[PDB]
Amino acid sequence: KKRVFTFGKGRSEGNRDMKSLLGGKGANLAEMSSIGLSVPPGLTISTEACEEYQQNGKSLPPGLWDEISEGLDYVQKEMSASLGDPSKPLLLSVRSGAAISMPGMMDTVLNLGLNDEVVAGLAGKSGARFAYDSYRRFLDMFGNVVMGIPHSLFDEKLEQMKAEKGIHLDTDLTAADLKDLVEKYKNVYVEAKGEKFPTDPKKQLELAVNAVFDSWDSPRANKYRSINQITGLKGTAVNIQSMVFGNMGNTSGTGVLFTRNPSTGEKKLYGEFLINAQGEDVVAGIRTPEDLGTMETCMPEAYKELVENCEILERHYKDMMDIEFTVQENRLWMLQCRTGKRTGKGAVRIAVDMVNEGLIDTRTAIKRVETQHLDQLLHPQFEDPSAYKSHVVATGLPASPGAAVGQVCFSAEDAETWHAQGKSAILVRTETSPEDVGGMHAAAGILTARGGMTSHAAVVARGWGKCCVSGCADIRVNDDMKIFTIGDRVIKEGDWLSLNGTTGEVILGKQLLAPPAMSNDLEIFMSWADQARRLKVMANADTPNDALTARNNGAQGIGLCRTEHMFFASDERIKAVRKMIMAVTPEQRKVALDLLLPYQRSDFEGIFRAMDGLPVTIRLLDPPLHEFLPEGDLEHIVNELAVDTGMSADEIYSKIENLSEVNPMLGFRGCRLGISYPELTEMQVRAIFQAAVSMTNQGVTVIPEIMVPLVGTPQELRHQISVIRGVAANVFAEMGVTLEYKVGTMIEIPRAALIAEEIGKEADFFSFGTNDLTQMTFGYSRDDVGKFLQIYLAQGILQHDPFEVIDQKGVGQLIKMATEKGRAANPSLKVGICGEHGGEPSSVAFFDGVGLDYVSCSPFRVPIARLAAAQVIV
Amino acid sequence: KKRVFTFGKGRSEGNRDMKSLLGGKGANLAEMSSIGLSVPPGLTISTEACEEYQQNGKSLPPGLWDEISEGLDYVQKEMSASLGDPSKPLLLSVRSGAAISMPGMMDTVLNLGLNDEVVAGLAGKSGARFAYDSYRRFLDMFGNVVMGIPHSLFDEKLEQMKAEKGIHLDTDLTAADLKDLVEKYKNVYVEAKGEKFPTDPKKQLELAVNAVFDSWDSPRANKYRSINQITGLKGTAVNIQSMVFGNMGNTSGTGVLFTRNPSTGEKKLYGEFLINAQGEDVVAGIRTPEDLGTMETCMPEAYKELVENCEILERHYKDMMDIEFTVQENRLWMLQCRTGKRTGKGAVRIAVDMVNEGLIDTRTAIKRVETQHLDQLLHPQFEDPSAYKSHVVATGLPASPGAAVGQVCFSAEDAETWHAQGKSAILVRTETSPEDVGGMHAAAGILTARGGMTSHAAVVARGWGKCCVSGCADIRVNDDMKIFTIGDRVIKEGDWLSLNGTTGEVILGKQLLAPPAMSNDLEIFMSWADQARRLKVMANADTPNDALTARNNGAQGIGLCRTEHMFFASDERIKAVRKMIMAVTPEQRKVALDLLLPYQRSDFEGIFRAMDGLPVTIRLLDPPLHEFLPEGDLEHIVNELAVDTGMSADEIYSKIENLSEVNPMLGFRGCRLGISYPELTEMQVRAIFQAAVSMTNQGVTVIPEIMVPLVGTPQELRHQISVIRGVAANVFAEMGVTLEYKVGTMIEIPRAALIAEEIGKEADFFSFGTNDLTQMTFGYSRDDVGKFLQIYLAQGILQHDPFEVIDQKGVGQLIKMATEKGRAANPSLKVGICGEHGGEPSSVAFFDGVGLDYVSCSPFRVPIARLAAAQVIV
Ligand SMILES: Nc1ncnc2c1ncn2[C@@H]1O[C@H](COP(=O)(O)OP(=O)(O)NP(=O)(O)O)[C@@H](O)[C@H]1Br
Ligand SMILES: Nc1ncnc2c1ncn2[C@@H]1O[C@H](COP(=O)(O)OP(=O)(O)NP(=O)(O)O)[C@@H](O)[C@H]1Br
Ligand SMILES: [Mg+2]
Ligand SMILES: [Mg+2]
Ligand SMILES: [Mg+2]
Ligand SMILES: [Mg+2]
């Protein structure tokens, strides 16, 4: 009702939509009971009661036990049995169950309600040997699971007796032995904990309820919620349920199954069964499970009912189901059902098959494949993760999903060489740097000791869809000795290593792969998602190849080409950029810009060709000037530059010192450059249009857009747009061709949103840069936030990394403000977002709600953004 | 839409409140005509017509001239004369006039409308010599001022004639000679430019109107508007006005006066007069000026009327007036009036006297002293900045206003040594550090190559009122060689140098200072200001002495005590801070904190004592951690730290590297420290309350407030407040005394304003940190904005430095948002501001308008803030 919800024959107080309050288990237990399936009657204590228990100093809140007892009165009346009553005993199980899968909860306990009086009656009704062996096992399990007594003490007593009676197997103990062994188990309670074994079933129950509530706060449970940043959950529910017995004979048993294969998706029952056994009997390890076919032979009637129950449950839930069942002398009892966990390949197969079956429509099917299911299918995967558990030597952050296998190297230069030679390289560094970008691209996998889900390594890796395990604090990298260590284990250069960027696992040796499981059912499924979504999904790509990759993965255009990232390919390009940054005179700047123009024009041609017929938004330079400079001592930087620039050493020292900035993220960057050196903008715009026309002449449909970075005033935008229009006029005149184009702005400075109504009058489109916008809104340095982020997460100051999940109340308020103002000022304004949040499912759902026109994300995140964009609609 | 506004006998179309449209001159001409003063009738062409002329490619827009002629018809009818008519000639002057004083506009031209026919009649009617000398003068002035013909060519003709006719002085020429000479002046037009002298008055007029409009865009006018950051002004007005003749004889003349002494403020007419001369002769400064007594003797009636008119004008304008007047044959004409420019000493004297006289009320009096006047009374100024223009060698950011003159040194230690020896030191560094604070205090001026107007070093400088020029990228400092360079120029140690911290100018040599003026009336005037203002003025002070200086200057309390700035005084304090920053264990931190506690407690006692009876707001640590480390090589820093820390060298290296940050302004600072290391907040809060109780026990009234820095979520504030309350309870229990106190938060992060309604529930007060808030809102690094600020100002992107003048449309919107949300959530919330804008007059007006409770500023700005709070001039 309020905290206690009963369920029984043909009725129930809860339902499947109350997982939050009753947990998954309690919710479906009620659901199965309400649809008329044979479910042993019971009650569920809500998750709110768990929270009240924790908030009340780990003690049951007033009144709760009376509500619990009312529920028990229902269960007793329904079973025509009573707790302490040896003539008509009621036995109970106590089962944990939160809203979602949660490790560290209390294991389920069975046969709660046994004592000497009840067992004596049980002995008379069903045999002494069976009764006292059950009593013995209950003493062991209840003590361990509820009281915290290790099994080793109960086993010590069992072996002691066996030793002193010369008996070699458990099976050789007489009922008299077991009756005395019961007394020994009882003693274990006093010896281990000093409490007695509770002989009143109601005390056993109170202890079990407390233990389940306590389990919610177990160190294992807290760590799971902390790591995965699970925030909603109030607590765990407690399910108290009447017992049914699958260990009464060869017409009895217990089993589990998925209604379809959870690996392949094949529509065929997939499960186990144990004849003459309780649920607990395999966990005890004493029995080996058999296939379902055994049930069909030994219980044809119960098997028949099970099959039809599976059809019922699939029809009712419209999904593949994970069910637990027990048969007590030909009578089938349903004990659990839930949506069945499955692989990505299984999810897509099941969803598509269920559509073909007419069981679900495409709207529902889109909700049957999780984004994480899709992600499995987009990358290489290990053939059998469980097979390599033995070889795992560390676990870091899953920076970029996918499997990688190769040989260890400690240098980006060596990674390129090895890749050129056809070797597979796993690049291992403490941290990665701009100079490492070449090798990182060449490496099969990247492993770093520092850095979070937003490190340089992590984001560049995730851009390329390249496996990356980041922030692996366990490793110590030693360049000088060409090794890295984990404890006393040494891993040398050349050694084979495997990385799982999805789980963060670091594995020794050359593990077996499977390629991405591209297949027809995925294309058909994604086509449903594509027809469903309202948002368009553009791509963040800076190179022709990345643009092509982006289109192959479904991108409908380029929402962001970061021109600052278009000079990593070769030394000549790096040399030219360095000349431009080191320039002091306007002639030195003209020389450097004239060198850069062919590279910009050529790359833009390649991007335009890849995106034939789709819009391409190119952004003006927003460079990290200090990052374009060599790494090393000021003696090496000045010397290397002197070679690349030809300038005197003192001129380089002067310029380096003049370029240094205390806070470069807020410094002389973005449109502040384009405005201060309009020649820079002229060069880039000339490359854009010269390339646009050239490709137009080759039959390529060019739909160019030019975007200004880091705008905080309408005047900045107006200034750069003026330059753009001038250069467009010239090029069009020179080449005898005029192309339509658009000019727009980043909205990544809080001020831009605050006066968006002024900026909207002057822009064809907005694109939210939520990386900088989050940085400026919070005042978090995107390069240093790791210094306090973990504490802030631990202390409940933040729920997620705001650089990963979009901050709705703060940043999101600027996004709504800018969008509203912009569209009011310019009804034809287009609004997108190209920050990292654009690929993050919950943020995509937010962006859809705010009415944006598109999201833009790096190429291998496009499929995810697509499915995410479809799931918020349906 | 009207562009021509006439004025004449007892009527006028404009008025004094239309300066924006008619200019000051045209407005007051109309105003004087309207109050019935004898003003020569005329018309004013609006500043809009100037803008239209500039927007129509420097040509008169279509209907304007016909509108000008209609105005001329009015003038002609009013004077009963006509242009070109020798029987009843109308002669005109053309006078420029913008809304405010503006150099670079066209000089006034007189006697427009003369030719041979008109002059022949003028001769007959009013004397040949007067006519032809007027003609000759007009030919010269019109040719030079309107046609661009140098005076030297006209003078060459005059001298030639004198040479041939054997006469020595101009005045010795007969009317016949002048008649011959005008023909020569006519020839000058042809010889000089190939132009003819326009004989038609309407053409003369057309050219004069064009020239005035063109003069608005003169290089000198552009530069003045640019350097003074004058934005708004559409153009200049043109005044076409009937002539009166002060050169008809010895019963005629021209004069200027102030209605009171502009230097002393004495209520006595202060001016000059020239018998038999035109206003041109007053500009030229060739004739020796005669005293007003000369006018009284020679034109008694005109003098009597002038004295009457001066009282009229003072009553009408309620201020001291600067008037120009002409006497034509005993008849007085008023030709200009405006509020008279005056010194700071004069402004105060005039304001107080006018109150005593019953002419104005205290309300108006507080408007009669500009903040710049008060600044002239309180601080040194250079006597005439334009005179040293030739010696300026660089211009940096005006970090702290004021004039400094001293000898160059490159070391804070030498600066204090020199100050002890009685020398004046200009401290020149690349950057300043904590260890330099002593020398900075001892130096007359500070010049840095890096840093902005709001870099904490500059902030500390402005605290002392010490002239500081920052961000002077032109200079290269060389400590070893004991010089610094600007281009090829070398400036040695010991050389004399002058700094203008208001303009950022760096001047070679010893420049002259304006003598500070003592004012006996300043106390009563400031008292009126104090009664008038609504805002309270608190002080930003971090030491007991600074607190006392703030109180002496009128501070009503401490709005911000920056605890990070409370460890500069000695080496022992710096070491203690270094022990705390280098701490890795909680024990090392507890040690360091125990060492810091006595300094904090001692300082807080001194501050509480100085501010006896007034509120003192102490802010928790917000430190630049990198800045607290020794200067020098990483070999020296590690050794110095190793000695006093007693940590291993490798532990120091690792900690130094772990503390380094890419963007420290957005890094591990503010409440991010207090939350990560609550022991730090415990220590500070314990010092605060222990000091508060101690001083209370000595009879001091302590009104303590504790403020949390850099909050962006309600959780951050809640966290630190929880710590504060815990410590408060302990200390009050320990010492047996309970004090009332308040807890609050900085609003200096855009997110804090965006969710202020949540933060307001948990704060007793907000204080806007508009330094950081501007930094985060614009994305401008407070230390590096100087690299593009000048370009942005020059290109019209910014109107002001947003770190100096509050950005109302952006940052101001967050201020209003936060204030509104906070007060809705907590009706008793107090809201202040302690950013640098708190001392800036226009920003103080804005803060008044948004309904803040107080402004807080550094001690020497308190007086300007007080007056600014009284004036509230947007
Ligand atoms: N009242 C009962 N009568 C008979 N058999 C029972 C009864 N309650 C339970 N069981 C069995 O006990 C075993 C464990 O129960 P759970 O429901 O806890 O499932 P678990 O795998 O332990 N964790 P989870 O599924 O993730 O929630 C199952 O096989 C069920 Br059929
Ligand atoms: N119609 C007239 N009859 C006679 N004399 C006249 C007439 N119009 C003007 N003058 C005089 O000409 C001189 C210059 O005129 P301005 O208005 O230009 O004053 P300036 O100082 O040069 N610029 P300012 O700073 O705005 O005041 C003044 O001395 C006036 Br009285
Ligand atoms: Mg189960
Ligand atoms: Mg950006
Ligand atoms: Mg004048
Ligand atoms: Mg601050």
Tab-separated table of N, CA and C in Angstrom, chain A residues 450 654 657-658 660-668 671-672 675 713 715-716 719 749-751 754-755 758 775-781 783-784 787-788 792 795-797 807 809-810 813-814, chain B residues 430 450 476 657-658 660-668 671-672 675 713 715-716 719 749-751 754 758 775-781 783-784 787-788 792 795-797 807 809-810 813-814:
chain	number	residue	atom	x	y	z
A	450	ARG	N	47.805	8.734	-16.784
A	450	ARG	CA	47.020	9.912	-16.328
A	450	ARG	C	45.894	10.242	-17.300
A	654	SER	N	62.422	36.278	-27.563
A	654	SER	CA	61.502	37.415	-27.450
A	654	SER	C	60.064	37.060	-27.825
A	657	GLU	N	58.477	34.445	-25.408
A	657	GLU	CA	58.119	35.124	-24.163
A	657	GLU	C	56.901	36.043	-24.373
A	658	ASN	N	56.799	36.659	-25.542
A	658	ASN	CA	55.648	37.493	-25.861
A	658	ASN	C	54.382	36.684	-26.116
A	660	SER	N	53.681	33.672	-24.489
A	660	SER	CA	53.271	32.982	-23.284
A	660	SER	C	52.069	33.666	-22.640
A	661	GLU	N	51.167	32.866	-22.096
A	661	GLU	CA	49.936	33.335	-21.500
A	661	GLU	C	49.692	32.591	-20.204
A	662	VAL	N	49.165	33.304	-19.225
A	662	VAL	CA	48.847	32.704	-17.935
A	662	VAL	C	47.651	31.763	-18.129
A	663	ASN	N	46.609	32.196	-18.858
A	663	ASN	CA	45.416	31.394	-19.071
A	663	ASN	C	45.102	31.385	-20.547
A	664	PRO	N	45.728	30.454	-21.303
A	664	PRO	CA	45.500	30.400	-22.731
A	664	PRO	C	44.090	30.067	-23.158
A	665	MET	N	43.345	29.289	-22.391
A	665	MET	CA	41.948	29.016	-22.772
A	665	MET	C	41.094	30.243	-22.869
A	666	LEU	N	41.489	31.315	-22.157
A	666	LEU	CA	40.762	32.617	-22.181
A	666	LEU	C	41.579	33.718	-22.825
A	667	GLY	N	42.574	33.358	-23.611
A	667	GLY	CA	43.569	34.305	-24.092
A	667	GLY	C	43.414	34.707	-25.533
A	668	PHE	N	44.546	34.776	-26.243
A	668	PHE	CA	44.592	35.379	-27.578
A	668	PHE	C	44.335	34.275	-28.539
A	671	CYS	N	38.277	34.120	-32.555
A	671	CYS	CA	38.139	35.262	-33.435
A	671	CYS	C	38.999	36.433	-33.067
A	672	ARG	N	39.580	36.416	-31.881
A	672	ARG	CA	40.524	37.465	-31.476
A	672	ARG	C	41.735	37.495	-32.390
A	675	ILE	N	40.442	38.742	-36.067
A	675	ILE	CA	40.209	40.190	-36.059
A	675	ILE	C	41.532	40.929	-36.009
A	713	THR	N	30.429	39.109	-28.793
A	713	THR	CA	29.742	40.337	-29.149
A	713	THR	C	29.285	40.229	-30.584
A	715	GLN	N	29.713	42.579	-32.698
A	715	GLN	CA	30.760	43.294	-33.449
A	715	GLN	C	31.853	42.354	-33.912
A	716	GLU	N	32.273	41.420	-33.073
A	716	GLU	CA	33.253	40.412	-33.515
A	716	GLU	C	32.759	39.660	-34.742
A	719	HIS	N	32.630	41.877	-37.854
A	719	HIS	CA	33.960	42.114	-38.376
A	719	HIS	C	34.414	41.000	-39.261
A	749	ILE	N	30.466	31.267	-25.616
A	749	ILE	CA	30.845	32.256	-24.591
A	749	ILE	C	29.548	32.668	-23.956
A	750	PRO	N	29.470	32.634	-22.623
A	750	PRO	CA	28.210	33.003	-21.980
A	750	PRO	C	27.615	34.318	-22.455
A	751	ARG	N	28.447	35.304	-22.692
A	751	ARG	CA	27.915	36.578	-23.220
A	751	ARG	C	27.170	36.438	-24.571
A	754	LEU	N	23.768	35.586	-23.720
A	754	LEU	CA	23.114	36.697	-23.042
A	754	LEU	C	22.621	37.808	-23.960
A	755	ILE	N	23.298	38.029	-25.085
A	755	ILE	CA	22.848	39.019	-26.092
A	755	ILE	C	22.663	38.357	-27.420
A	758	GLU	N	21.056	40.134	-30.462
A	758	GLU	CA	21.890	40.952	-31.314
A	758	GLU	C	22.707	40.115	-32.270
A	775	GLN	N	33.055	25.293	-19.792
A	775	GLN	CA	34.254	25.824	-19.141
A	775	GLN	C	34.026	27.244	-18.557
A	776	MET	N	33.429	28.138	-19.343
A	776	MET	CA	33.198	29.495	-18.905
A	776	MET	C	32.039	29.618	-17.923
A	777	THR	N	30.986	28.827	-18.090
A	777	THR	CA	29.830	28.866	-17.169
A	777	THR	C	30.205	28.411	-15.785
A	778	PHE	N	30.894	27.295	-15.667
A	778	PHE	CA	31.298	26.763	-14.365
A	778	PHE	C	32.553	27.466	-13.842
A	779	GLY	N	33.368	28.033	-14.714
A	779	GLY	CA	34.737	28.412	-14.356
A	779	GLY	C	35.695	27.251	-14.155
A	780	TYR	N	35.424	26.129	-14.837
A	780	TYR	CA	36.247	24.943	-14.785
A	780	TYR	C	37.193	24.978	-15.946
A	781	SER	N	38.477	24.882	-15.646
A	781	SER	CA	39.476	24.618	-16.669
A	781	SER	C	39.308	23.199	-17.197
A	783	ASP	N	41.325	21.547	-18.803
A	783	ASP	CA	42.584	20.837	-18.752
A	783	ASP	C	42.981	20.460	-17.343
A	784	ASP	N	42.348	21.031	-16.322
A	784	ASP	CA	42.764	20.841	-14.924
A	784	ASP	C	41.629	20.438	-13.993
A	787	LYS	N	41.619	17.850	-10.966
A	787	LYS	CA	42.220	18.057	-9.651
A	787	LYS	C	41.209	18.107	-8.518
A	788	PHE	N	39.959	18.411	-8.848
A	788	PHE	CA	38.904	18.413	-7.849
A	788	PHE	C	37.650	17.671	-8.260
A	792	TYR	N	34.518	16.370	-5.861
A	792	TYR	CA	33.207	16.947	-6.067
A	792	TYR	C	32.159	15.894	-6.337
A	795	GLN	N	31.538	14.022	-2.942
A	795	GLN	CA	30.839	14.858	-1.939
A	795	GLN	C	29.457	15.274	-2.436
A	796	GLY	N	29.013	14.809	-3.593
A	796	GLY	CA	27.667	15.119	-4.026
A	796	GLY	C	27.512	16.514	-4.561
A	797	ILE	N	28.622	17.229	-4.785
A	797	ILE	CA	28.593	18.570	-5.395
A	797	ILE	C	28.197	18.487	-6.857
A	807	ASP	N	24.995	20.181	-18.514
A	807	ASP	CA	24.415	20.746	-17.315
A	807	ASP	C	23.165	21.505	-17.721
A	809	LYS	N	20.444	22.815	-15.862
A	809	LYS	CA	20.020	23.971	-15.129
A	809	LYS	C	20.880	25.205	-15.373
A	810	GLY	N	22.164	24.997	-15.679
A	810	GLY	CA	23.093	26.128	-15.858
A	810	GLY	C	23.393	26.353	-17.312
A	813	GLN	N	20.442	26.471	-19.577
A	813	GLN	CA	19.661	27.719	-19.517
A	813	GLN	C	20.211	28.736	-20.500
A	814	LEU	N	21.521	28.792	-20.675
A	814	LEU	CA	22.104	29.621	-21.728
A	814	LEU	C	21.778	29.114	-23.113
B	430	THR	N	59.432	42.202	-15.219
B	430	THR	CA	58.583	41.463	-16.149
B	430	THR	C	57.260	41.147	-15.485
B	450	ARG	N	54.068	42.247	-18.161
B	450	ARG	CA	52.887	41.385	-18.208
B	450	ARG	C	51.797	41.875	-17.246
B	476	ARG	N	61.545	45.149	-22.623
B	476	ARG	CA	62.276	43.902	-22.344
B	476	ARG	C	63.241	44.151	-21.198
B	657	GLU	N	55.157	19.651	-9.858
B	657	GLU	CA	54.593	19.279	-11.153
B	657	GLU	C	53.084	19.019	-11.042
B	658	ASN	N	52.663	18.461	-9.918
B	658	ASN	CA	51.245	18.169	-9.710
B	658	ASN	C	50.438	19.442	-9.484
B	660	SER	N	51.231	22.466	-10.894
B	660	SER	CA	51.229	23.327	-12.092
B	660	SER	C	49.917	23.179	-12.897
B	661	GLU	N	49.439	24.290	-13.451
B	661	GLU	CA	48.147	24.340	-14.122
B	661	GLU	C	48.250	25.104	-15.437
B	662	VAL	N	47.492	24.668	-16.437
B	662	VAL	CA	47.471	25.336	-17.729
B	662	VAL	C	46.703	26.627	-17.641
B	663	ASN	N	45.555	26.624	-16.967
B	663	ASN	CA	44.745	27.854	-16.749
B	663	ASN	C	44.407	28.035	-15.275
B	664	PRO	N	45.327	28.616	-14.514
B	664	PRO	CA	45.093	28.763	-13.063
B	664	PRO	C	43.886	29.588	-12.662
B	665	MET	N	43.479	30.551	-13.458
B	665	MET	CA	42.292	31.335	-13.133
B	665	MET	C	41.032	30.511	-13.095
B	666	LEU	N	41.033	29.369	-13.761
B	666	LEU	CA	39.890	28.445	-13.756
B	666	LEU	C	40.237	27.083	-13.139
B	667	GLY	N	41.278	27.033	-12.321
B	667	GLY	CA	41.820	25.805	-11.794
B	667	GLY	C	41.504	25.526	-10.339
B	668	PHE	N	42.502	25.070	-9.593
B	668	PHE	CA	42.270	24.428	-8.312
B	668	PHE	C	42.435	25.543	-7.314
B	671	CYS	N	36.799	27.973	-3.467
B	671	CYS	CA	36.188	26.944	-2.600
B	671	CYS	C	36.533	25.549	-2.940
B	672	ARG	N	37.108	25.338	-4.111
B	672	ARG	CA	37.615	24.029	-4.504
B	672	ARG	C	38.719	23.540	-3.541
B	675	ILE	N	36.900	22.978	0.146
B	675	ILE	CA	36.127	21.746	0.117
B	675	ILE	C	37.053	20.535	0.122
B	713	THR	N	27.739	26.293	-7.354
B	713	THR	CA	26.615	25.413	-7.020
B	713	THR	C	26.184	25.712	-5.596
B	715	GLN	N	25.692	23.391	-3.494
B	715	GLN	CA	26.374	22.387	-2.717
B	715	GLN	C	27.720	22.879	-2.210
B	716	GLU	N	28.490	23.555	-3.037
B	716	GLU	CA	29.766	24.109	-2.601
B	716	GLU	C	29.567	24.998	-1.411
B	719	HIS	N	28.451	23.109	1.750
B	719	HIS	CA	29.589	22.390	2.304
B	719	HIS	C	30.443	23.266	3.232
B	749	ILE	N	30.781	33.592	-10.596
B	749	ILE	CA	30.768	32.497	-11.603
B	749	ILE	C	29.415	32.603	-12.266
B	750	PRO	N	29.362	32.649	-13.588
B	750	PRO	CA	28.081	32.803	-14.258
B	750	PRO	C	27.043	31.803	-13.764
B	751	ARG	N	27.445	30.554	-13.498
B	751	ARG	CA	26.465	29.578	-13.027
B	751	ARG	C	25.804	29.990	-11.675
B	754	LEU	N	23.009	32.041	-12.578
B	754	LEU	CA	21.990	31.270	-13.295
B	754	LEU	C	21.114	30.430	-12.375
B	758	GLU	N	18.628	28.985	-5.846
B	758	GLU	CA	19.055	27.893	-4.959
B	758	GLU	C	20.142	28.358	-3.979
B	775	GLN	N	35.621	38.053	-16.436
B	775	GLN	CA	36.510	37.067	-17.018
B	775	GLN	C	35.743	35.857	-17.576
B	776	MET	N	34.860	35.248	-16.799
B	776	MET	CA	34.116	34.081	-17.245
B	776	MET	C	33.039	34.432	-18.255
B	777	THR	N	32.371	35.566	-18.103
B	777	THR	CA	31.285	35.960	-19.042
B	777	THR	C	31.802	36.266	-20.447
B	778	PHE	N	32.883	37.012	-20.537
B	778	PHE	CA	33.501	37.321	-21.816
B	778	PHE	C	34.447	36.245	-22.316
B	779	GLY	N	34.970	35.410	-21.422
B	779	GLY	CA	36.057	34.531	-21.742
B	779	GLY	C	37.356	35.267	-21.913
B	780	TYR	N	37.526	36.384	-21.226
B	780	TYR	CA	38.744	37.184	-21.277
B	780	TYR	C	39.621	36.865	-20.103
B	781	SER	N	40.837	36.436	-20.360
B	781	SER	CA	41.817	36.209	-19.304
B	781	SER	C	42.195	37.557	-18.714
B	783	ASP	N	44.695	38.322	-17.060
B	783	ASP	CA	46.108	38.535	-17.095
B	783	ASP	C	46.605	38.768	-18.502
B	784	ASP	N	45.826	38.457	-19.549
B	784	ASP	CA	46.320	38.462	-20.917
B	784	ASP	C	45.411	39.198	-21.901
B	787	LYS	N	46.484	41.677	-24.956
B	787	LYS	CA	47.012	41.310	-26.283
B	787	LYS	C	46.082	41.632	-27.420
B	788	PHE	N	44.791	41.797	-27.126
B	788	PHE	CA	43.822	42.173	-28.160
B	788	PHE	C	42.898	43.309	-27.764
B	792	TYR	N	40.517	45.676	-30.184
B	792	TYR	CA	39.078	45.627	-30.005
B	792	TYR	C	38.508	47.004	-29.766
B	795	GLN	N	38.797	48.998	-33.105
B	795	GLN	CA	37.876	48.511	-34.178
B	795	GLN	C	36.420	48.635	-33.748
B	796	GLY	N	36.132	49.277	-32.626
B	796	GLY	CA	34.761	49.447	-32.256
B	796	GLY	C	34.082	48.189	-31.756
B	797	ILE	N	34.841	47.113	-31.461
B	797	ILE	CA	34.276	45.891	-30.896
B	797	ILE	C	33.875	46.088	-29.470
B	807	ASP	N	30.029	45.878	-17.831
B	807	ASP	CA	29.265	45.503	-19.042
B	807	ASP	C	27.809	45.249	-18.607
B	809	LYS	N	24.870	45.103	-20.497
B	809	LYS	CA	24.101	44.190	-21.288
B	809	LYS	C	24.439	42.680	-21.039
B	810	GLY	N	25.681	42.373	-20.648
B	810	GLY	CA	26.084	41.040	-20.406
B	810	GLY	C	26.263	40.730	-18.933
B	813	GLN	N	23.503	41.734	-16.717
B	813	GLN	CA	22.295	40.950	-16.766
B	813	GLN	C	22.391	39.808	-15.772
B	814	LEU	N	23.581	39.213	-15.602
B	814	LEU	CA	23.770	38.204	-14.600
B	814	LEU	C	23.631	38.802	-13.246
